[PDB]
């Protein structure tokens, strides 16, 4: 990829870049999944052994406060601001908020809201005054890459994201193990109840939670499952990684071309009865200038 910005890249020290990041040592892990219920079109399989070079990854998704500092320093204008609208979940649109008639096919719970963007996540009249440490949302893949570059970082590859999110467990279902609520404790912010009609908020949240909510995984990462989808560097495909080659098994970068970029981790909207996509092997995609109220990102860096 070859982006273009209108801000210069500031000088930063290695110690500044690494703050809030964890160092993932070089090694191998088993990537992918073989859940019999996985949707074939998602390409969760095959399970494969992947070798990665050492890397750093953020413990937390990028927060509103952090994104605000980036915008302050650079004047960056997000894709949602250029387009003038972004996607908001229907239950979060205040009555009377002007909305577009647009329909996401198959997903009528998404509303295109003029003026929804990172600082007004439910549209005109909303703000982030009470959400400084929540993940920034309504950021597109372009916005994420812009922030990461300004920060001296990059987006993780899908393999880096998954190795870090798995937190040192071999082929577990979730970042922490195989049970969704071990000991009856919620471990992530997803949907409870009847999707898309009623979210009971059993886990504490019916929208985003602070980036440090719930316990971390074994490597110290928070909210890799649930909360917000997280953009990765890779172009999406369902089958590039089915090939067995150095390109797909050693520091894999994904296909060299595509139309949508990978997103990992699930969000506060995911539920077993609909998408079941909060498992750590799960994956989907979105086009790179798209933005939504349930999608953010975390950064990685070469050491």
């Amino acid at each position: 990829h070859m982006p273009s910005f209108d801000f210069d890249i500031p000088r930063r020290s290695p110690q500044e870049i690494a703050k809030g990041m964890v160092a993932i040592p070089g090694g191998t892990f088993r990537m992918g999944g073989e859940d019999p219920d996985a949707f074939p079109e998602d390409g969760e399989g095959p399970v494969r052994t992947v070798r990665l070079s050492p890397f750093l990854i953020d413990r937390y998704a990028v927060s509103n406060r952090q994104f605000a500092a980036f915008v302050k320093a650079t004047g960056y204008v997000t894709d949602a601001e250029r387009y003038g609208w972004s996607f908001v979940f229907h239950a979060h649109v205040a009555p009377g908020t002007p909305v577009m008639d647009a329909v996401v096919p198959e997903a009528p719970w998404w509303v295109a809201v003029p003026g929804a963007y990172w600082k007004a996540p439910e549209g005109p009249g909303s703000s982030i005054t009470d959400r400084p440490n929540h993940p920034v949302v309504h950021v597109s893949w372009n916005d994420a890459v812009a922030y990461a570059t300004w920060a001296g970082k990059r987006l993780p590859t899908e393999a880096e994201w998954e190795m870090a999110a798995r937190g040192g467990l071999d082929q577990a279902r979730y970042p922490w193990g195989n049970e969704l609520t071990p000991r009856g404790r919620h471990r992530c912010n997803i949907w409870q109840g009847t999707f898309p009609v009623h979210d009971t908020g059993e886990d504490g949240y019916t929208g985003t939670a602070p980036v440090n909510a719930f316990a971390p995984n074994g490597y110290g990462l928070y909210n890799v499952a649930g909360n917000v989808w997280e953009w990765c560097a890779d172009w999406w495909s369902a089958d590039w990684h089915a090939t067995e080659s150095p390109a797909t098994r050693i520091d894999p970068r994904g296909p060299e071309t595509g139309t949508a970029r990978v997103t990992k981790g699930g969000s506060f909207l995911c539920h077993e009865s609909y998408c079941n996509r909060y498992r750590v092997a799960a994956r989907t995609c979105n086009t790179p200038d798209s933005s939504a109220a349930h999608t953010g990102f975390r950064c990685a860096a070469d050491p």
Partner: peptide, 16 residues
């Protein structure tokens, strides 16, 4: 009926 959708794209709403 078709694959569940978690990522809503700007392209998806363009229709005539």
């Amino acid at each position: 009926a078709t694959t569940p959708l978690c990522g809503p794209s700007r392209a998806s709403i363009l229709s005539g």
